[PDB]
C-alpha cells in the first residue's frame, strides 16, 4: 500500500470501529445502553482514530521550512518535547518525553518541526524502541547533520496497570547517530546536559 | 441485572474480543500481519478484560476479618491508596488517587480491605464522580460508622492526549458522609490531614 | 455583527495582516529580505491568526454531552487546567493555568468540555479579569450548578520584559458565584485544595 | 547597513506602527474603537519598539570600564544572566538564560558588562542560535580572553502555545571558543560548574 | 500474668525460638544447612526478641525526672518521632512517626522521655489503633496536662508487600485527650504545627 | 532435590508453619488466645509462603513471547522497577528498587516480562548481592544480548530498625554483564540515564 | 521643601557625594590612589542616587491610564513583585517581595503600574513598615477600591551581615485598608491565594 | 546575687574550668597530654564561658533604639531567627529557629534588635519551654505591644546522638500574649503567615 | 595501656565526672543546687561516657559474621550511615553520615555490621579526618577486600555555634585505597553512585 | 603604610565618618533631622567601619593551633562557609559561599579556622577575583600542603539592583593550587563533592 488515509477514509471506518466498539461493550459484560455507555462506541471509535494520525501524515509536507542558518554547527538540543504514543501490544498508552540533539552541517530545522516530527511517529501503534529510532532517522535525512542523538523516556500503563502495578517503571531508550554515536565525549555532554 | 460474569463467562467472549479487536487494526489502517499485530487482537482481548475485572467481584465477600474495636470513635486514615480505572466514554485510562477517613464506631474494617473496597469500582468502565461515591458508600454500608469521606484526584488520559492535550489537569472529586457532612470541623481537619 | 468568522474570512485576511506585517518589519529598522525574515509576514500572520481562533468558535457547538449525572451533588474541581491568552493591551501574551470547582446540580458536564470552555475564551484579545469572568459564566448558563468557582494565575510578558524585567510577576484573578460566593466554608474548601 | 536607527528614526515610524497595528486588529475580527483596543496601536506599536531596541546600540561604547586585571588566568563564570528575545519567524517571545565563563588573559570585563552584552543582542528579531553566538563572539572580541564558553537556555512561546502546545520544551544552545572548543576537560568543567 | 519478662527468661525462650524459625526454614521449602540459613533460626530468634522487648519494661521504670516546671500552660509539640513496629495481625513490620502534643498544667515531662514512652508501646505486636491511643494515655497519666493529642503515620508492610504492592498508602490515626478533644481551635492549631 | 514446589506442597505445610508460630507467639511472651494473635500463626503462616513464592517460578516459565525484534544495536533500559523481599538472615523484609539495562542482539525482551524476572527471584530468601547477580543471568541468557547491567537499591529493615536505628542506610549493589563490564563507557553512560 | 527634585538638582549635588566618599575610603583606612577606589568614589555617589530615585518621581505622574473596568468585584492579586530598598538607618540594601490584593470599585488598575507605584516608594531612604502602608494608600487613593491588602516580605542586609549574621531572617509586614481588615473573611483569603 | 559577670570574672574563672576538664579528660579513659587534648581543657575552656555569656548580659544595654515609630499598628514577623542553646539538663547543645511577631502600638522596637534579644536568653543553660516564655516577655515590658507570639523550634542533640539516636525529632514550643493569646483569628493568621 | 574499660571502670569513673561537672556548673556561674541542674552533673555524667563508650569495643568482638560469600566481585555501596562524634579539641558534636564501598573477594561482610564498625570508632574523642581513615582501614583488614572507599560528611558544632555561627558548612572528609585509590575509573563511578 | 589600624584608630575615624554620612544624608536631599536619620550617621559609620574589619587582622594571628597529623595525605573539604563582603568598586554587598578543598601534606589546619581566613579576606573593600585567590593562597602559606582548591560564588548587589534588576546572576570564580591545578582527576573529583 504506503500512501497516508485521510479523513474520507477515515470517515468510513467509523461505523465499523464504532461497532467494533459496541460489540466490546457486550462483550465486557457491559449494558451498551446506559446514559454513560450510550453514545460511546462512536466517541471511543473516533478517540482511537486520533491516536493513529501520524499514518496520514506524511515526512514531507510536514518538513519544509529547514533554514539554512549553517553558521553556526554546535550542538543544538530541544528537551522535554512531550509525547504520547499507543502501545502496538495491547493498544495502551505509554505516554513520555523525548529529547533530542545534533550538530548542525550546513542546514538547521526549524524548533516547532522537531516537535511535529516527533508527533508524526509517535500518533501510531508503536514499540518504544522503533518510535525512537525513526525520529533520529527522519531528522538526519531531513537535516543531514553531523549527528543526532535521540533519548525517549516514557511510562507504560500496560506495567503500571494491569500484570502488576508498578508506577515508576520507567523505560528509557535511546539511538546515536554520527558523533553521537562515534565520539562518546560528545555523547557525554548530551546526556549530562539533557537533565538540566 | 446481577451475575458477575465468571471465569467461563470470560473464555467465551476472550475469542469475541479478539474479533472485534483484530477488526479495530483493520478499520485502523494497519495490517494484522505484522509481527506486533499479530498476537494483539488477544493481548488486547486480554488486556481490557483486566481493566474490567472488577465487574465479576462483590463487596459482601470481599468484605471481612473486619474486626470489632469499637472502643476508638478516633479518626481513622488511610491516603494515597494508588487507583488506576477506565473512562467509560472513549474507553482511555484515568489515574491517581483515593483517600479514605471515617469514625469507627463499634467496627474497625482490616486495613487492607479499604483498598480492596477502591479496587472493586476502579476495575470497571466508570465515571470519577460516580467510582468515588461508591467506594464511599461501601464504606458506610460494610462499616455502619459516625463518617465517611472519600476524595479522589486522578490524572486522566482523554484529556492529557486528544482533544487539548492538557496535563496536570488533576480533576479532584470529594463526598462526604455523616459527621464529614454535617461537622465541618471534621471535614475541615480532613483536608489538612490528607497531606503531612 | 456578532456571528464568529470562520477560514474563509480568515483566508482572505491573510494578504492584509500579511502585509501589516511586512509594513512592520521594515519601521523596526529591519530589512524584510533576510533569509529569516523572508517568509515572516506570513508566518506571523498565519500565527497571530491561531492566538486568536476563540473567536470563530460558539459555546453551543463545543457544548453538548454535559451528561445529567445528577446523583452526586458535591464538589467537582479541574485544576491545572493550561492557558494561553493575549493581552489585549499590547497583544503580548500571558500565559497560565486555571482552575474549576462546581457544585453540579442536575447536571454535570464532561470533563473533556471544561479545558475546551478555556479555549474558547483564551484564544482572543483580553485582559485577564475578563477571561475568568466568562469561563465561570458560560460553566454556569451551560450546567445550572448551585456554585461555580473560577480562580486564574498567569505570568504576563507586558511585565516580565518591557517596563521591568520582573519575573514571577504573576497575577491571580479569581471570580466566585453561588454558594462559592455566598459560603465562604465552601469557598475556603475550594481554594485550600487547589494547592494539593 | 550599519545606523542604529534612533530616536527621530523612533519617532518617525512609531505612528507608521501604531497604523499598521490599526489594520492587524481590524483584519483580525475585533473593533478597534472598544476601550481596550482604543489605544492599542500605540501601546502595541511602542512595546514592539521596546522589544527591538537593541539594534540602536553599538557594543564599541557599551563596552568600557573593563579592568586591566590580568593576573588572574582563572575561569571567571557569571550564570542565570536572564533574556528576553523575540523570535524572527511569528514573532513571538521566547525567554530563558544565558550563561557564560572564560579565562582572563590581561584584560577582565566589568561584571555588569557581561549582562549588557547579553542584552544588546536579545533586543531583536533573533534567532536562539545565532543569539547565542554573537554573545560569544562580543566577548571574545571585547577581551581577547584564552576562552569562551556561552550556553543559552530558553523555552519558545512560538511552540510553547501554537503548534502543538508542549511547554517545558527548553531548548538548549551552546557555543564554546578557544580553550573551550579545543581543552574539553576546561569544557567539561564548565558545564558542571553552571548548575551548582 | 503481668510481671516482666526479662533476659533470664529472655535466655529462655530462645532455642525455643531457634526450633521453631528452623521449623519454618524447611516447612518453607528450603536447606537450613545452606550457608545463609546456616545460623538464621539463631538469628531472627535473636531479632523477635529485640522487636518485642517493649513488654518487659515499665512506664513507671522509663520516667523518674518528670520536672516541675509547672509554670508554662502553653502547648509543647515533639513532633517526627522515628517509629518501628509490628503487626501482630501477621507479624510484620509497620513502620513511621509520631507527633506529640501537650499543654503542660505543673509539669513539662523530660522532652528526651517523650521519646522513650514511645518505644515501650511501639516494640510489641501491635495495631496502630491501639499503637496510639496507648501513648496519649501514658502521657496524660505520668504528667496530668490539661490535654494531650497524638496522631501517627505510618505504612504497614503487610499492604505494601503481601496482597500486591501497594506503596504510599499510608495511614494516620490520631487521639486527643483533654482540652484537644474540646478545644477545637487548639486541636487544629496542633494539626497546622505538625506540617512546618 | 530441586523441581518446582507448586500449591500442593504448601497446602500441608502451611499447618505446620501455622503451628510454628503458635510457638512463637507463646515464646515471645503472648497470648494466642487474645482476639489479635488468635488467627495470626495462619496469617503469619500464609504471608511467609508470598515472601516465598518465586520459589515455585520457573524462569524460562515465564519468558514465552521474547519478540524478536535485534534491529536496535541500541541500550534499553527499564529504571524503578519495584521490588520486595526477604532478609535469608534473619527473616526481615528489605526493600527497594531495581534498573536494569541492557544491549539487544537479535532478541528484544517484552518490557513486561523485564519486571517478571525480578520477582521470581525478589520472592524468596535472598541475600541483595544474590538476588542482583540472579536478575542479571536470567537475562543474559533469556535475551542472549551485547550486554546486561542491573543494579539495586533497597533499605534493610534489619538495620533500621534491630541492630541499630541507623535510617536511610540504602545499600546499591551492581553487577554488569558484557559489554557494560567490558566498555567503560557504556556501563558509565548506563549509571547515567538510571539516575535521570 | 517638598517639590520633585528633578535630574538637576542631583547633577550638582554628585560632585559633593563624590567628595564625600572619597572622604569615607580614606576614613575606612584605604587608599583612594589605588586602581579601585581611584574612581570609586563617583560610582558610590553615583549609584547612592540611583537607589534614592523614588523621589524624584510622583505618584499620580505615573498612573494615568487607570482603565476603567468596573465591572468586576471579584479580587485581582498581584504577587511576587520584586523589590529591592535601603536601610534608613545604617544605609544596608535590604530585599525582598511584595505582594498587592485590592476590590475593584468603579476603577482597576493596569497591571504594570500596580507594580510601578512600589519602585518609587521602594527607592528612597525606607523602613519596611513605611514602604509597605505606602504602596497600600497610593493606591487606595489612586483607584477609590473597595479594599487594599499590601504585604512585604525581606531580609535585612543589616541583620544578615552587620550585628549579627542571622540569615534567613526575613521580615514580613502586613497592612489591609478596607474590607480587608473589615472583613476577616476576604484578608485570610487573600493570604492563602498569595502563597500559592 | 544578680549583677552581671564579666571578664574580669570569666577571667578568673578559665583555669578552674581548664582543670575541671583536664580532670574529665583522664576520668574519661583518654590521655590528656596527647597532641590534639593538650589543649582541650582551655580550649573547651573558653567554649564553655562562651555557650553561657547570655547571663552576664543586661536587656537595659541591650534595648535601646526602641524607634517611636508607631503609626503602623499593623502585624510585624521576623521570622527564622537562627537560635542556638544549652541543654540545662545535660549541658548538650540544641540548635534551632526562633520566629516573633508583634503588634506595633506606640512604638516598633528596631529589627536588628529583635535578633539581640533572643541571644541574651538563647545563650544560657536552658529549657525550649523556657527560654521562649522569656523572649516573648521582654518584648511586652520593652516595646508595650498590643501582644507577642514567638515560637520556637529546634532539635536537640540529647535524643539526636545519646539515648535513641532520633533526627529530624523537632520540638515546637509557643507562647502566645496580648492579642495573640485573646483573638485567635490574629494568633492564627500569625502562625500561617509565618511558614513562608 | 590499650584493654578496653567496661562498666566496672566506668561506675568507679561516674562520680569523678559528676563532681567535675559540679564545678564547671559552679565555676560557670550558674548555682548548680537548683531543680533543673540538681542532677546534671551526673545527668551530663553518664551522658558522656556514652559518647566515649566506642573507646571500650574491640572490632574482634564486633566483626564476626564475615560471611564467605565471594562470587560477587561487584561494587557494595552502603550509604547514608548515621553517625556522631566529638571533637577532641573541644568536646563539641559534630554530627554526620558515613558512605561506604568495597569490592568483595572472597568475603562480603554482613551489612549489619558494617555500621557497627563506623560506631566503635564514632564513639570516642575524635577528629574528621581521622575518624575516616580507621573505619577504612578495619575494612581492608576484616575483609581483605581489593578496595575501600569511605567518604564521611558532617556538620561541625564547633563553627556552627561559637567561633562565628556558621551552618550548612559541611566537611566532607574522604580515604581511597585498593582499586577505589588507584583505579579512579571505580573511584569515580564510585562516588557519582553515592548521590543517590 | 601596613601595620593594623584598631579601636584606637576606630574611635579616631568615626567623627569623620558620622559627618561624611551626614553631608551624604543631605546632598540626597532628604532632611537629617527626621527621626529615623537623626543617628543615621552613626550607624552607617560604625556599620561600615564592621564591613571593613578584615584590614586590622593579620593572618598570622589569626591562625596559631595548626595541628600536625600529617598522616591522611587524602582531601579534605569545607563547603558552604557563608561570605558577606564589600564591592570595591561601588561600596555594595556582594554576598554568596565558599567552598574549600586541600590535600593534606604534614598538618591539617583546625577546621573551625578555615573559616576564619575568610573573615579576614571578606570584611575588606573587595573584587571576587581577588577575594578567591588571596583566601587560596593564604591557606597554602599556613599549611603547605599538595594542593588548594578554592570556589567562592556571590551575587553582586550592585548587578541585583543598580543596572536594573538582574537578579539570579551569580558569580562563580575558582583558584586552584598545587595537585589541582596539575592533577585534574583530583580537580573534577573536587568540583563533584561540593554539590552533594
Ligand atoms: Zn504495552
Ligand atoms: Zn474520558
Ligand atoms: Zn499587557
Ligand atoms: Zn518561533
Ligand atoms: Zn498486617
Ligand atoms: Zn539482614
Ligand atoms: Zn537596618
Ligand atoms: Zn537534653
Ligand atoms: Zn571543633
Ligand atoms: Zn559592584
Redesign the interface.
Given at each position: 500500500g504506503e500512501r497516508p488515509?485521510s479523513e474520507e477514509?477515515?470517515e468510513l471506518?467509523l461505523p465499523?470501529?464504532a461497532?467494533?466498539?459496541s460489540?466490546?461493550?457486550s462483550?465486557?459484560?457491559?449494558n451498551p445502553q446506559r446514559?454513560?455507555?450510550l453514545?460511546?462506541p462512536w466517541?471511543?471509535a473516533?478517540?482511537?482514530?486520533?491516536?493513529?494520525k501520524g499514518?496520514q501524515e506524511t515526512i514531507s509536507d510536514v518538513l519544509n521550512?529547514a533554514?539554512?542558518?549553517e553558521?553556526?554547527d554546535?550542538?543544538?538540543?530541544?528537551?522535554?518535547?512531550?509525547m504520547?504514543s499507543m502501545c502496538?501490544?495491547?493498544?495502551?498508552?505509554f505516554?513520555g518525553?523525548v529529547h533530542i540533539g545534533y550538530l548542525?552541517n550546513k542546514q538547521?530545522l526549524?524548533?516547532?518541526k522537531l516537535?511535529?516530527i516527533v508527533?508524526i511517529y509517535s500518533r501510531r501503534?508503536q514499540?518504544?524502541?522503533r518510535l525512537?529510532?525513526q525520529i533520529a532517522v527522519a531528522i538526519t535525512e531531513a537535516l543531514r547533520p553531523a549527528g543526532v542523538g535521540v533519548?525517549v523516556?516514557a511510562t507504560?500503563?500496560?506495567?503500571?496497570?494491569?500484570?502488576?502495578?508498578?508506577?515508576?517503571?520507567?523505560?528509557?531508550?535511546?539511538?546515536?547517530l554520527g558523533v553521537f554515536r562515534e565520539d562518546?565525549?560528545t555523547?557525554?555532554?548530551f546526556?549530562?546536559?539533557?537533565?538540566?
Open positions: 488515509r477514509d477515515n471506518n465499523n470501529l461497532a467494533a466498539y460489540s466490546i461493550l462483550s465486557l459484560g457491559e446514559q454513560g455507555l453514545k460511546t466517541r471511543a473516533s478517540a482511537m482514530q486520533f491516536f493513529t499514518y521550512d533554514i539554512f542558518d553558521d553556526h554546535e550542538m543544538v538540543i530541544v528537551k522535554d518535547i512531550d504520547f502496538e501490544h495491547h493498544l495502551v498508552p505516554v518525553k548542525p538547521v526549524g524548533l516547532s516537535a511535529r508527533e501503534l514499540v518504544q524502541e525512537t529510532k533519548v523516556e507504560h500503563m500496560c506495567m503500571v496497570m494491569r500484570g502488576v502495578q508498578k508506577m515508576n517503571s520507567k523505560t528509557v531508550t535511546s539511538t546515536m562518546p565525549k555523547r557525554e555532554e546526556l549530562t546536559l539533557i537533565r538540566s
